[PDB]
RNA sequence: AGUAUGAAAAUGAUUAUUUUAUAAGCAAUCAUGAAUAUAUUAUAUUAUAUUAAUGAUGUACCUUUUGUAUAAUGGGUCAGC
RNA sequence: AUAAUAAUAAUAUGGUAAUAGAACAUUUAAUGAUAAUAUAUAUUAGUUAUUAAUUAAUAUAUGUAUUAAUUAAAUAGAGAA
């Protein structure tokens, strides 16, 4: 389990091992959140329009 | 690019003839205008010719249906495949000798493209190539082929 | 030895010999030595201490190691790479076994950076 | 000048029978020192300092005084090639303004009767000069162009290609 | 008249300055996988650090991937050598790395007999001519 | 909802933006790519890593309305709005100026009396945009071809981002063979060129006082070291006339072409050697398959000799009387 | 002789690139022009790939033999066993 | 007092019948992470002194290895009947 800190030199670095599943999941979650937000806003706007 | 230029693809049914026989005729219809090809077929005294003509007609019809005008269509290429399941029969000869007769069945496929686009494009390409062509120079700088040797000979 | 007409010219070639193998170069050329150097690494610079012949279009200085005083010819090492891999197949004429003789010799690549009169 | 020994690019082998063989040249070795080896080659595409003529060097460049753009050939012997008549017998500026005007007028009037050659014959002067002086009626030019076009059309396939090749060659031969 | 026909300059890597041909090296390995044991050892062993110290113009990435262990190396010219170091030990891996570093990125290629020099400079002396020879033929 | 992933991402983005605005020194130092670049080109140590980072950062203020049409070809999701006072825009201009000056000067030194057009061409060859881009590529200045979101997902620090080149690059610009034609600002090559120029500018800035010629030396090592055969740049209309004019201008006898040697007349491929004499001084040798051709070649050779004259450093700076005009 | 799938080869037709109608032999190897194709570092005077200009070199493979280009044995090609 | 790698000097490295030593491919059993950004197979171009594996692009599967590696074994490798 190496890190960029372990190699005592600026040129050497370790790219982060973030599983390609976890990342995907995160992305999905973000998308969902966005949907919840934007859609909600749209709904609100619609309601406002209906009102007046 | 090749695929995009407007084409029509026509296929025969299971012709009862041998590939060789077919190709005997098909060699004649190489880059012919469809109508000309059809005419040729009409008058060719070979059994396969009828079917070929029919196929060509069908192709023309398809072209008409889908956008293209008969007088623009030429045979871009046309070929013979063996069709499926040829049935082998034994053919008994004198003494105990045995031949095995096989009854071949083929199919003719053609691709018709258009003189308006495809042919024009190829002509253009040819022209370009010609333009590119370096001239024959009398004292042309022909490279001194061979390795030098690390030593001047001049 | 009056070395003025070499001094005055703009184009100049040299025929230096590494391990007696003569290479004829101008500045900016890439010499492909057919062996691996251990003395020099990549990025190092070699001052050629054996130059058989310096030459302009019409004049040429010559001599068995001509004085290092007279010229400066120095090459930088760029690459140590091998020439492409080959399997020449060795066999006799009624013998089923074959001996695959593999070959991937090594090259050192130089670049003639400086080539001048001193 | 320099008093160097001069040499051919020598081979230990027979030059007549084996000049392309590199090994011979390699084998040959000459006594240490300076040498003069005249280049066995024309200096057409070259930009080498030992190729430039003294007249094109600045009056300061040390190479002027030195002797290595050698004048081996002598101009007395070499025949004039593709030269104008004005070069063989010097240029003349005899023709006045009135005469010039007249010539111009003539050109304007009848190009087929008073063609360039005819004009030249009349006034002891070059066709080129006449051309420079005076433009012919544009109609005539147009006609000529048309004729040229017709001629071109009349060509076969091969000839056109040949012409093109020739043109290309011509273009090339000013690169150097 | 004089008309200019366009052209571009050709880079000669070593004549002025010298850019170092190798730029990045990616040590690729796997936690699970006996083939990647030597690589793992190498990664562990301060050798990498030493290498970094030696050669700071070239950067060392260290990836974690499920397959065999690799040393993909990236060069100035653009090309990328890739050496799978399946089942090698520490020293062999190091040697491989060294090899990678030494090479310029250029593709491998068969050389003919004695094809040594490679110039883009017009011959100092001219190309021989029959008419401008010192010795005429017969 | 134990995790607000949109919030975290937003925070990350903000941080990135802040870093870009600053280009903090520590962060720059931490970046490996930048360090490698610095080592590679043997840059002077007065040049900081922040400066280097800045050089790689092209001016990207406001996201265009061309983004809103990914359906119409283009989408810009890689970049993050740059600081207006901390871009490479200023440096770039300076770099360009330097290139224009110095390269040109060098060319002049090499070849006095180089026809203006030819000189211009040479200059372009030395420092055209494409060439500069190529140089940049060689150096290893890579482009930020990864979306911010993607980066976040990966969980890579800002150092890496800093190390990369940063401009409004069209993600999805050559997919399915469709290329959205845009201005100079959105081309990769241009960006690369700018970066190159910026580096030079930076160098100049750092070494303006301690060692003024350092920048020039660097340029020579990198830009002027590149081979260009000046002989390949010329193309003459009717050179004979020009030659004659030149002769007239100078103190030379009128030039005359003359046959020196001839072989294979009456053949497919003959050889005619004609020299252009001015009295006795041969002014240009010229070979040809025809006489006319040979003559032309001779003239061309003469012209080349006149122009591409390369005087020594021991000479006193020679200044030509411009180009011959006819 | 299950059902799906199948860019496995041999084999046929066709198209493209290229070479080919003064040239003679295991059809390859090495040298070496030229033409074409591809290449998001061809910066090019670039690199690879394809291709019977041209030159040199070159008696198929196995078996059995003192010894095989042999006009001694064996094999039509490919796939499976 | 070992192993791995690298040096220096030296000696040795044709080979039928034959002897000796060391590897690789394929398939099955024991142990066994991982993942559609993954894998398997195929084509093309690279890479590693290369019957092998790996990289990139491409095509087809497949919610995914009897996968890496060490053992155990073999219906374990075919132009020769
Ligand atoms: Mg079927
Ligand atoms: Mg009967
Ligand atoms: Mg039969
Ligand atoms: Mg025997
Ligand atoms: Mg054998
Ligand atoms: Mg002989
Ligand atoms: Mg024999
Ligand atoms: Mg038989
Ligand atoms: Mg042995
Ligand atoms: Mg078996
Ligand atoms: Mg088999
Ligand atoms: Mg076999």
Q: Is some CB atom of chain F closer than 8 A to the CB atom of B94?
A: no
The pair phi, psi for residue A45, each rounded to 5°, is -60, -45
Mutate to test the interface with D, among E125, E129, E135, E138 (most CBs of D within 10 A): E125
Interface test with E, best of A4, A6, A11 (most E CBs within 10 A): A11
* Measured CA distances, D33 to B46, C58, D4, D45 (Å): 89, 14, 9, 30
Mark yes or no for CB contact D164/B135 under 8 Å: yes
| Chains in touch with A (≥3 Cβ pairs < 8 A) | E, F
C11-CA/G18-C1' distance, Å: 42
Tokens of E32: 């699970």
Scan residues 88-147 of B and list those with Cβ closer than 8 Å to E: 144, 147
Is F281 within 8 Å of D71 when comparing Cβ atoms?
Answer: yes
**Measured CA angle at F103 (ends F100, F107), to 5 deg:** 125
Other beta carbons within 10 angstroms of residue F88's beta carbon come to 27
The partner residues of F257 in beta bridges, in order of sequence, read F276
CB-CB contact of B93 with B99 (8 Å): yes
The residue to which tokens 């040299």 are assigned: C14
The rounded distance, in Å, linking the Cα atoms of F266 and F229 is 36
Residue D176, chain F, CB below 8 Å: the answer is yes
In angstroms, the CA of D52 and the C1' of G42 are apart by 35
Sort strands E59-64 and A12-14 into parallel, antiparallel or unpaired.
Answer: parallel
Contact between E122 and D46 using a beta-carbon 8 Å cutoff: yes
Tell me, yes or no, whether chains E and F touch by having 3 or more C-beta pairs under 8 A: yes
Dist CA B33 CA B47 (whole Å):
21
Which experimental technique did the depositors report for determining this structure? cryo-EM
Do D71 and F280 lie within an 8 Å CB cutoff? yes
* Buried-state track F272-281, b at ≥16 Cβ within 10 A, e below 16: bbbbbbbeeb
What lies within 8 Å, CB to CB, of F29 at 6+ separation is A10, F35, F49
C65 touches chain B (CB under 8 A): no
**How large is the C-alpha radius of gyration of chain B?**
25
Q: Within window 62-81 on C, which residues have Cβ closer than 7 Å to strand H?
A: 81
The answer to whether D72 touches F273, Cβ cutoff 8 Å, is no
Of residues F267, F59, F92, the one with CA closest to residue F183: F59
CB E49 within 8 A of CB A9: yes
Count how many residues are written for chain C.
118
* Local structure of residue F224 (DSSP, 8 states): I
Eight-state DSSP code of residue F256: E
Task: Outline where DSSP puts E strands in chain B.
Answer: 8-11, 73-82, 87-92, 98-103, 106-114
Instruction: Give the CA distances from residue E54 to residues A11, E17, E61, in Å, rounded to whole numbers and listed in that order.
Output: 11, 20, 16
- Of F251, F249, F257, the closest CA to residue F285 belongs to F257
> Are E125 and B147 within 8 A, CB to CB?
no
Cβ atoms within 10 Å, residue F293: 23
Q: Which ligand lies nearest the alpha carbon of B88?
A: 3
- Mutation for A interface: F11, F77, F155, most A CBs within 10 A: F155
Distance F201 CA to G66 C1' (A): 87
Residues 126-165 of chain F with CB under 7 A from strand H are 153
Q: How far apart are CA D86 and CA D109, in angstroms?
A: 28
Report yes or no: F295 and D82 within 8 Å, Cβ to Cβ.
Answer: yes
Q: Which of C24, C76, C29, F138 is closest to E14 using CA atoms?
A: C76
What spacing in Å lies between the alpha carbon of A10 and ligand 10's midpoint? Answer: 57
Three-state SS for chain C is CCCHHHHHCCCCEEEEEECCEEEEECCCCEEEECCCCCCCCCCCEEECCCEEEEECCCEEEECCCCCCCCEEEEEEEEEEEECCCEEEEECCCCCCCCEEEEECCEEEEEEEEEEEEC
- Residue C82 CA to ligand 9 centre (angstroms): 27
Task: Give the CA E47 to C1' H52 distance in Å.
Answer: 29
Resolution (A): 3.2
Terminus-to-terminus CA distance in chain D, angstroms? Answer: 31
Task: List all residues of chain E from 92 to 121 with a beta carbon under 8 Å from chain F.
Answer: 120-121
* Cα separations in angstroms, D98 against D103, D104, D135, E105, F289: 9, 10, 16, 77, 45
> What is the DSSP code (8-state) at residue B111?
E
* Nearest ligand by distance to the CA of C98: 5
Can you tell me whether residue D72 is helix, strand or coil? coil
Q: Please, which residues bridge with residue F227 across strands?
A: E10
Beta pairing partners, B30:
none
Longest dimension (CA), chain B: 82
DSSP annotation of F277 reads: E
């Amino acid at each position: 389990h190496p890190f960029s800190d372990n190699y005592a030199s600026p040129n050497i670095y370790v790219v982060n091992d973030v599983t390609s599943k976890e990342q995907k999941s995160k992305y999905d979650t973000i998308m969902k959140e966005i949907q919840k937000l934007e859609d909600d806003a749209t709904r609100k706007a619609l309601e406002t329009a209906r009102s007046a | 690019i090749e695929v995009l230029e407007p084409s029509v693809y026509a296929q025969s049914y299971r012709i009862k003839s041998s590939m060789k026989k077919a190709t005997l005729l098909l060699r004649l219809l190489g880059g012919l205008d469809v109508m000309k090809a059809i005419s040729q077929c009409h008058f060719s005294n070979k059994k396969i010719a009828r079917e070929v003509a029919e196929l060509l007609q069908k192709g023309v019809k398809d072209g008409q249906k889908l956008g293209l005008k008969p007088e623009d269509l030429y045979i871009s290429q046309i070929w013979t495949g063996s069709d499926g399941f040829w049935r082998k029969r034994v053919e008994f000869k004198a003494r105990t000798r045995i031949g095995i007769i096989s009854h071949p069945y083929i199919h003719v496929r053609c691709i018709l493209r258009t003189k308006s686009v495809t042919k024009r494009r190829l002509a253009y390409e040819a022209h370009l190539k010609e333009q590119k062509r370096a001239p024959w120079v009398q004292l042309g700088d022909k490279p001194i082929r061979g390795v030098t040797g690390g030593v001047y000979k001049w | 030895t009056d070395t003025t007409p070499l001094k005055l010219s703009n184009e100049l070639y040299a025929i230096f010999k590494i391990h007696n193998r003569p290479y004829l170069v101008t500045e900016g050329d890439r010499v492909i030595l057919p062996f691996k150097l251990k003395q020099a690494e990549v990025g190092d610079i070699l001052n050629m201490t054996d130059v058989t012949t310096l030459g302009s279009r019409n004049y040429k200085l010559v001599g068995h190691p001509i004085n290092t005083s007279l010229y400066t010819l120095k090459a930088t090492v760029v690459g140590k790479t091998k020439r492409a891999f080959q399997t020449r197949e060795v066999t006799k004429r009624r013998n089923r076994r074959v001996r695959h003789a593999k070959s991937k010799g090594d090259l050192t690549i130089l670049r003639i950076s400086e080539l001048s009169m001193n | 000048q320099f008093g160097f020994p001069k040499t051919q690019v020598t081979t230990i082998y027979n030059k007549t029978k084996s000049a392309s063989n590199y090994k011979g040249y390699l084998k040959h070795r000459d006594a240490p020192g300076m040498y003069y080896q005249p280049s066995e080659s024309i200096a057409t595409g070259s930009v080498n300092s030992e190729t430039i003529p003294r007249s094109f060097m600045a009056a300061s460049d040390p190479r002027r005084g030195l002797d290595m753009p050698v004048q081996s050939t002598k101009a007395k012997q070499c025949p004039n090639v593709l030269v104008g008549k004005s070069t063989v017998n010097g240029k003349t500026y005899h023709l006045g303004p009135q005469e010039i005007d007249e010539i111009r007028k003539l050109r304007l009037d009848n190009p087929q009767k008073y063609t360039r050659k005819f004009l030249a014959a009349k006034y002891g002067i070059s066709p080129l000069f006449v051309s420079m002086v005076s433009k012919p009626s544009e109609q005539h030019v147009q006609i000529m162009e048309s004729r040229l076009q017709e001629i071109q059309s009349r060509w076969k396939e091969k000839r056109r290609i040949a012409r093109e090749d020739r043109k290309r060659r011509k273009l090339l031969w000013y690169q150097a | 008249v004089v008309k200019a026909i366009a052209r571009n300059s050709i880079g000669r890597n070593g004549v002025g300055a010298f850019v170092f041909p190798c730029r990045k090296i990616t040590l690729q390995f796997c936690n699970w996988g006996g083939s990647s044991e030597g690589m793992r050892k190498f990664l562990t062993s301060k050798r990498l650090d030493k290498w970094g110290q030696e050669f700071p113009w070239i950067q060392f990435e260290v990836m974690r991937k499920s397959g065999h262990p690799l040393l993909r190396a990236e060069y100035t010219n653009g090309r990328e050598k890739v050496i799978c170091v399946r089942n090698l030990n520490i020293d062999n891996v190091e040697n491989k790395l060294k090899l990678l570093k030494d090479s310029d990125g250029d593709i491998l290629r068969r050389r003919t007999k004695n094809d040594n020099v490679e110039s883009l400079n017009s011959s100092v002396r001219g190309i021989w001519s029959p008419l401008h020879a010192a010795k005429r033929h017969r | 909802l134990p995790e607000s992933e949109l919030a975290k991402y937003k925070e990350y983005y903000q941080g990135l933006k802040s870093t870009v605005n600053e280009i903090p020194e520590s962060v720059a130092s931490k970046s490996p790519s930048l360090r490698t670049l610095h080592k590679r080109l043997q840059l002077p140590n007065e040049l900081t890593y922040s400066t280097l980072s800045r050089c790689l950062t092209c001016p990207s203020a406001k996201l265009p309305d061309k983004i809103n049409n990914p359906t119409k070809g283009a989408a810009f999701v890689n970049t993050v709005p740059t600081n207006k006072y901390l871009d490479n825009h200023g440096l770039n201009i300076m770099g360009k100026n330097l290139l224009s000056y110095h390269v040109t000067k060098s060319i002049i030194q090499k070849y006095p009396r180089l026809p203006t057009v030819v000189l211009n061409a040479a200059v372009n060859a030395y420092i055209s945009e494409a060439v500069l881009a190529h140089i940049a590529k060689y150096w290893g200045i890579e482009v930020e071809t990864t979306s911010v979101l993607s980066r976040y997902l990966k969980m890579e620090p800002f150092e890496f981002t800093l190390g990369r080149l940063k401009f409004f690059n069209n993600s999805l610009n050559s997919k399915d063979g469709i290329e959205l034609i845009t201005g100079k600002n959105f081309s990769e090559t241009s960006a690369l060129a700018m970066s190159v120029r910026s580096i030079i500018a930076a160098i100049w800035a750092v070494t303006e006082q301690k060692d003024s010629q350092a920048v020039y030396r660097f340029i020579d090592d990198h830009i002027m070291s590149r081979k260009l055969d000046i002989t390949k740049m010329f193309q003459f209309e009717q050179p004979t006339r020009e030659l004659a004019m030149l002769c007239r201008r100078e103190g030379l006898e009128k030039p005359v072409s003359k046959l020196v040697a001839e072989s294979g007349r009456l053949s497919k491929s003959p050889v005619f050697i004609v020299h252009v004499f001015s009295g006795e001084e041969t002014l240009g040798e010229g070979y040809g398959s025809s006489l006319k051709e040979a003559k032309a070649r001779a003239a061309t050779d003469a012209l080349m000799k006149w122009y591409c004259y390369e005087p020594l450093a021991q000479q006193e700076p020679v200044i030509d009387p411009g180009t011959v005009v006819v």
